[PDB]
Amino acid sequence: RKQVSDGVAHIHASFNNTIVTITDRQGNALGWATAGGSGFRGSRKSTPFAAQVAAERCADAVKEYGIKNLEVMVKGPGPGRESTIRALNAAGFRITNITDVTPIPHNGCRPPKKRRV
């Protein structure tokens, strides 16, 4: 219902996990998934396998609105950012550009410092 065929994709990257989400231009999301939902419990979540499999799982879940192009909203410096883009460029979507929107806070608050290592 109400096929869009255009939108932007938000990508999250973290040391402990990674998730992929998809929305439209104005910003009402349509897809949601966790790489841990595809299994791989433990440190293997950081491996590209879970990220990529969650990528095609979300892509299959979102075919129903019929999209053809998307945009890369990547977040976080975590390992990855490579499985998702090159799994979605051939999943039935064509990329448009790339961005860097990972925050760089201007020395606002004290970071968690109790951590030795």
């Binding site: 590209p48 410096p77 390992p79 990855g80 950012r81 490579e82 090159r86 410092k113």
Partner: protein, 51 residues
């Protein structure tokens, strides 16, 4: 701090970034200011080679 590379590597190979980490400056700035310590780059490695 950023990665935008391709499929093949997927594991480690960022030990060059470990060398470029410069653990001194990060371990110095994460915990308090010193104003006399980051000098370790000079004046104590070349100037203290005592035999």
């Amino acid at each position: 701090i950023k990665v935008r590379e391709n499929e093949p590597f997927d594991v480690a190979l960022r030990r060059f970034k470990r060398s470029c980490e410069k653990a001194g400056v990060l371990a110095e700035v994460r915990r308090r200011e010193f104003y006399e310590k980051p000098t370790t780059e000079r004046k104590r490695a070349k100037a203290s080679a005592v035999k």
